[PDB]
Design a protein around this motif. Structure first.
Motif, PDB file in Angstrom:
ATOM      1  N   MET A   1       0.833  -1.245   0.000  1.00  0.00           N
ATOM      2  CA  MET A   1       0.000   0.000   0.000  1.00  0.00           C
ATOM      3  C   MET A   1       0.851   1.273   0.000  1.00  0.00           C
ATOM      4  O   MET A   1       1.806   1.438   0.787  1.00  0.00           O
ATOM      5  CB  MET A   1      -0.954   0.017   1.201  1.00  0.00           C
TER       6      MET A   1
ATOM      7  N   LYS B   1      -8.493   1.043   4.692  1.00  0.00           N
ATOM      8  CA  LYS B   1      -9.538   0.246   4.059  1.00  0.00           C
ATOM      9  C   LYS B   1     -10.093   0.960   2.825  1.00  0.00           C
ATOM     10  O   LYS B   1     -10.364   0.320   1.801  1.00  0.00           O
ATOM     11  CB  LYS B   1     -10.674  -0.112   5.044  1.00  0.00           C
TER      12      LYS B   1
ATOM     13  N   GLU C   1      -7.697   0.464  -0.115  1.00  0.00           N
ATOM     14  CA  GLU C   1      -7.853  -0.843  -0.761  1.00  0.00           C
ATOM     15  C   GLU C   1      -9.078  -0.869  -1.674  1.00  0.00           C
ATOM     16  O   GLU C   1      -9.005  -1.374  -2.796  1.00  0.00           O
ATOM     17  CB  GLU C   1      -7.948  -1.956   0.284  1.00  0.00           C
ATOM     18  N   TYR C   2     -10.187  -0.294  -1.193  1.00  0.00           N
ATOM     19  CA  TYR C   2     -11.423  -0.244  -1.939  1.00  0.00           C
ATOM     20  C   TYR C   2     -11.247   0.554  -3.242  1.00  0.00           C
ATOM     21  O   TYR C   2     -11.706   0.121  -4.319  1.00  0.00           O
ATOM     22  CB  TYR C   2     -12.555   0.339  -1.073  1.00  0.00           C
TER      23      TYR C   2
ATOM     24  N   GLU D   1      -8.343   1.175  -4.839  1.00  0.00           N
ATOM     25  CA  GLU D   1      -7.447   0.445  -5.739  1.00  0.00           C
ATOM     26  C   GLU D   1      -8.164  -0.682  -6.502  1.00  0.00           C
ATOM     27  O   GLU D   1      -7.889  -0.900  -7.687  1.00  0.00           O
ATOM     28  CB  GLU D   1      -6.220  -0.098  -5.003  1.00  0.00           C
TER      29      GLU D   1
ATOM     30  N   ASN E   1      -2.539   6.148   1.474  1.00  0.00           N
ATOM     31  CA  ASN E   1      -2.942   6.313   2.868  1.00  0.00           C
ATOM     32  C   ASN E   1      -2.099   7.403   3.547  1.00  0.00           C
ATOM     33  O   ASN E   1      -0.861   7.408   3.429  1.00  0.00           O
ATOM     34  CB  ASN E   1      -2.767   5.004   3.664  1.00  0.00           C
TER      35      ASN E   1
END
Length: 102
Positions: free
Chosen positions: A1, A71, A74-75, A77, A85
């Motif tokens: 990330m 979170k 990630e969503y 991406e 982040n």
């Protein structure tokens, strides 16, 4: 990330191109002050606002403490959107220089 410290994100205020910051905290939290010019999109509402993001920009995602924001990265991406982040979130950023809307 991908990740950025608050100090490094602040440094980008010195840059020519404006940075895209998205605050994903609840309305109750952002009401106490948010980063000037941040998009306010509470986490639970993010899947209803995919059309606020485009595929050419980088988005720096900030929450209270850098947990919720991970979170969201990630969503985004998984939906083809560059997201980074912001480590430590608003806790790290502090409460100075913030905006509150009249």
């Amino acid at each position: 990330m991908k990740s950025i410290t608050t100090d490094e994100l602040k440094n980008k205020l010195l840059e020519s191109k404006p940075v895209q910051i998205v605050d994903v905290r609840t309305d109750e939290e952002t009401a106490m002050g948010y980063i000037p010019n941040a998009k306010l999109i509470p986490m639970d509402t993010i899947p209803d606002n995919l059309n606020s993001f485009n595929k050419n920009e980088i988005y720096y995602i900030v929450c209270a403490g850098g947990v919720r924001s991970a979170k969201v990265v990630e969503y985004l991406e998984a939906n083809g959107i560059d997201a980074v982040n912001v480590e430590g979130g608003m806790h790290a950023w502090g409460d100075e220089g913030l905006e509150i809307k009249s």
